[PDB]
Amino acid sequence: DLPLDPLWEFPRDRLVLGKPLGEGAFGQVVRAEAFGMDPARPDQASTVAVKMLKDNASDKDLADLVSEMEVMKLIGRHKNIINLLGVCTQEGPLYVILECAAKGNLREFLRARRPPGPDLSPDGPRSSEGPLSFPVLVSCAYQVARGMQYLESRKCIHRDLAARNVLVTEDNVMKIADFGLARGVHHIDYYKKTSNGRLPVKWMAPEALFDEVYTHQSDVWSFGILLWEIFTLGGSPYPGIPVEELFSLLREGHRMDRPPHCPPELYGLMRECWHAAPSQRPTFKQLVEALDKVLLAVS
Ligand SMILES: *C(=O)c1nc(NC(=O)Nc2cc(O[C@H](C)c3c(Cl)cncc3Cl)c(C#N)cn2)c(OCCN2CCOCC2)cc1CN1CCN(C)CC1=O
């Protein structure tokens, strides 16, 4: 096999694999029960997410998974990222064991929590009150900014930051996922639509799309798209615009409109994140500060 790294190796027989969660370009993720993830409580159960190779896996798929494992080892721990818990490399298939986020991704979290429509009959004293409030939406944005600030401090560029790549825990903690990934940036099919209808090109900064240049400031552009997703309660960006039209609109400097029920403070931050010049966009540290000021004011 690969060499044994005792810092991270976890006995595979302490895992009970459960129902799949999803599949990526290289790898599939399944939920699992782990026993004794904390060695001081060797019989204690926890729920984890296990990434492994697909059945049709190539050598490149394996190298990609090994690279992701090594990034996750070096990233260190932060509240607002999916953290590595362990690996299984010996005497069996390669597993990368990560935190599981029980509420799924932020896009599905928001879409399932949109406020009741005008067609519902009032029933009780809170018929108009949906699950989502403005301070909680701001906190979601602030937590993503804090996770990105951490990743940036560890020299990690995400390259596809989007609400679907932010996961939500049982306690509504945002955790950035899939930050350590080979994404085939020199062979992106810009017209590709996912099985859920997503066009990932809509999150790419112009220097990434047109020039294949990625920096932390290209992640800031994507964060602005993510902010728009938050304040549309999981809307899809550039509504109605196919990829061919997107290319021409971006060349003309088009930006998304201010969404309904979005204060100008938040649309202002979106527009700063989409400034054409990467040096004219805020840094993640500045976004953390700006969002914290709003969060404190409204809390
Ligand atoms: C464990 O806490 C857990 N997790 C989920 N959902 C989930 O997405 N967990 C998750 C996924 C994940 O990466 C995958 C590939 C992914 C997916 Cl599936 C979607 N978008 C992006 C990504 Cl990147 C990682 C990593 N790294 C970590 N965690 C879960 O589900 C619930 C189903 N439901 C959720 C809301 O949206 C629709 C689906 C359930 C659980 C553990 N739980 C909790 C509740 N019990 C009752 C059942 C259960 O299994």
Residue 36 belongs to domain with CATH number: 3.30.200.20
Q: Which residues is the chain interrupted after (C–N above 2.5 Å)?
A: none
> How was this model experimentally determined?
X-ray
Do 160 and 277 fall within a single domain? yes
The full DSSP string for 192-214 is: ---TT---GGGG--HHHHHH---
Radius of gyration of the chain (CA): 20
Residue of 53, 97, 105 with the most ligand 1 atoms within 8 Å of its CB, for mutation: 105
Asked whether the beta carbons of 164 and 176 are under 8 A apart, the reply is no
Resolution to one decimal, Å: 1.5
Concatenating the DSSP letter of every residue in 127-172 gives: TT--S--HHHHHHHHHHHHHHHHHHHHTT---S---GGGEEE-TT-
Query: What is the domain-level CATH number for residue 171?
Result: 1.10.510.10
Q: Residues 54, 28: contact at Cβ < 8 Å?
A: yes
Q: Which of 273, 288, 156, 153 is nearest to 217 (CA)?
A: 273
Domain that holds residue 79: 12-99
Same domain, 213 and 92: no
Does residue 66 contact residue 133 with C-beta atoms inside 8 Å? Answer: no
Retrieve residue 104's tokens.
Answer: 């799924």
In a domain? residue 192: yes
Boundary-marking domain end, from 83, 99, 115: 99
* Ligand 1, atom 36, residue with closest C-alpha: 104
Q: Is 29 in the pocket of ligand 1 (CB under 6 A)?
A: yes
Q: Based on the domain organization, do 113 and 201 belong to the same domain?
A: yes
N- to C-terminal Cα separation, the chain: 52
- In this structure, is residue 3 part of a structural domain? no
16 and 146 housed in the same domain: no
For ligand 1, whether the C-beta of 85 sits within 6 Å is no
The reply to whether 170 falls in a domain is: yes
Structural domain ending residue among the three candidates 82, 99, 116: 99
In a domain, 2, yes or no: no
Co-location of 172 and 288 in the same domain:
yes
Residues 271 and 125 occupy one common structural domain? yes
Q: How far is CA 164 from each of CA 9, 106, 108, rounded to the nearest angstrom?
A: 29, 6, 7
**How long a stretch of residues is the chain?**
299
Final residue belonging to a domain, choices 75, 99, 123: 99
The verdict on the CB of residue 104 being under 6 Å from ligand 1 is yes
Whose CA is closest to 144, among 184, 95, 109? Answer: 109
| Number of structural domains found in the chain | 2
| Statement to judge: residues 110 and 72 lie in one domain | no
Same domain, 26 and 77: yes
CA of 272 to the centre of ligand 1 (A): 32
Q: Is 49 in the pocket of ligand 1 (CB under 6 A)?
A: yes
Instruction: Tell me phi and psi for residue 84, to 5 degrees.
Output: -70, 135
Distance of CA 36 to the CA centre of its chain: 28
Residue 202 domain flag: yes
Nearest to 173 by CA among 149, 146, 151: 146
Pocket test for ligand 1, best of 19, 26, 29, 110 (most atoms within 8 A of CB): 29
Q: How far is the CA of 295 from the centre of ligand 1 (A)?
A: 27
Q: Which 8-state DSSP code applies to residue 116?
A: P
Using CA positions, which residue lies closest to atom 16 of ligand 1?
Answer: 22
* 7 located within any domain: no
Classify residue 237 by its DSSP letter: S
The CA-atom distances, in angstroms, between 270 and each of 56, 182, 185, 255 are 41, 27, 25, 10
Distance CA 146, CA 141 (A): 9
What's the CA gap between 282 and 35, in Å, rounded? 43
Residue 111 lies in a domain: yes
Token digits for 233?
Answer: 């309660």
Crossing angle of helices 284-298/134-153, nearest 10°?
160
How far is Cα 98 from Cα 76, in angstroms, rounded to an integer?
12
**Angle at CA 221, nearest 5°, toward 299 and 51?**
85
| Residue at 221: amino acid letter | W
- Are 133 and 252 part of one and the same domain? yes
Count the neighbouring beta carbons within 10 Å of the beta carbon of residue 183.
15
Structure tokens at 235: 């809307």
172 and 91, same structural domain? Answer: no
Cβ–ligand 1 distance for 12 under 6 Å, the answer: no
Whether 160 is a known active-site residue: answer yes
Q: Is there a single domain that holds both residue 119 and residue 254? A: yes
CA distance 129 to 137: 15
Q: How far is CA 203 from CA 118, 125, 172, 215, 221, in A?
A: 32, 40, 24, 14, 8
Domain identity same for 94 and 123: no
